[PDB]
Symmetry: C3
Subunit: 131 residues, 3 copies
């Protein structure tokens, strides 16, 4: 099966100065017997929000056992937003499995001390391609 | 053909307390003779906006004949935004066709009574994968 | 190989009243011997920002040698935002290669004179499908 997916509807609220795994957003590539070719990986966090005192936001990353392959963030445009609105976020990266990839995961990291909120659907998806 | 797509450039402006189809964002899976395996579905609404009086926004969903499989929203961070800016939105879900899926559609639902606006490109895409 | 990708971590800051290529976001389809079937193309700019004096934003497009196939934008909800926050943006389009497509690129265009900022990861991805 060339389509892999994991999805969640919540995670414990946390702050982090470093990239930390988003629990449940994990694809086991080795366990699927995929050892070569490429994966197009999509991290989709459609409804996150950040709480903080200093232009809040969330960094998200796609990581393998080799670490972060791609990342990005959303941030609010106000020091302390009136309400910390829902800021849809998608990240897309293509990785060579041949180089020794055995898992893929989503990770997150605070912007300026923000608490990080997922309280609804979020997914981590991959499509396997071979020549 | 394992790639399916539908796209629109507008829809009638409406409010809805329930998920209602976004006209044109519909993939006919049965008609394509796809009866087994998985679909990775992307709902891409890159340039929506919501008009309202109370922190406006839009919920979007991916639905089949079996109902909603994934959803999320954007919301503004001000009670009545200065201007209701364009809030890009993407949603990604992977569904088992074997379980009896015959169509896939995008749907939307008001946040707090918002009118819902698409006046430019939006797409619903799927990639079919089989083991 | 049915998966194509290009990624960047920055681009020179520019303004543009027209769609102009985002340097590095280019897939050479002809060079890959792909002459028929479909491509699902994702333009992923997860961490852009716009600087301007009049509700800033960025239009993004997916273009081929035949021009723009899909586009959209983000805009801020304040005339001059307190801080020009990071506004994640994804665009998804499906194109018929048979119709004479030889390359795919990401492009951008100012909203109301905005300077356009990418200073971190951004990607252009494609999956090739044939019947």
């Amino acid at each position: 099966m060339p389509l892999l997916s994991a999805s969640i509807v919540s995670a414990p609220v946390v702050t982090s100065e470093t990239y930390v795994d988003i629990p449940g957003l994990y694809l086991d590539v080795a366990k699927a017997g995929i050892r070569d070719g490429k994966l197009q990986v999509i991290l989709n966090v459609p409804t996150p929000y950040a709480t903080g005192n200093n232009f809040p936001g969330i960094y998200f990353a796609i990581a393998t056992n080799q670490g972060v392959v791609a990342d990005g963030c959303f941030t609010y445009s106000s020091k302390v937003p009136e309400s910390t609105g829902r800021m849809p976020f998608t990240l897309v990266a293509t990785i060579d499995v041949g180089s020794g990839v055995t898992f893929v995961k989503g990770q997150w990291k605070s912007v300026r001390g923000s608490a990080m909120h997922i309280d609804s659907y979020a997914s981590l998806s991959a499509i396997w391609g071979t020549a």
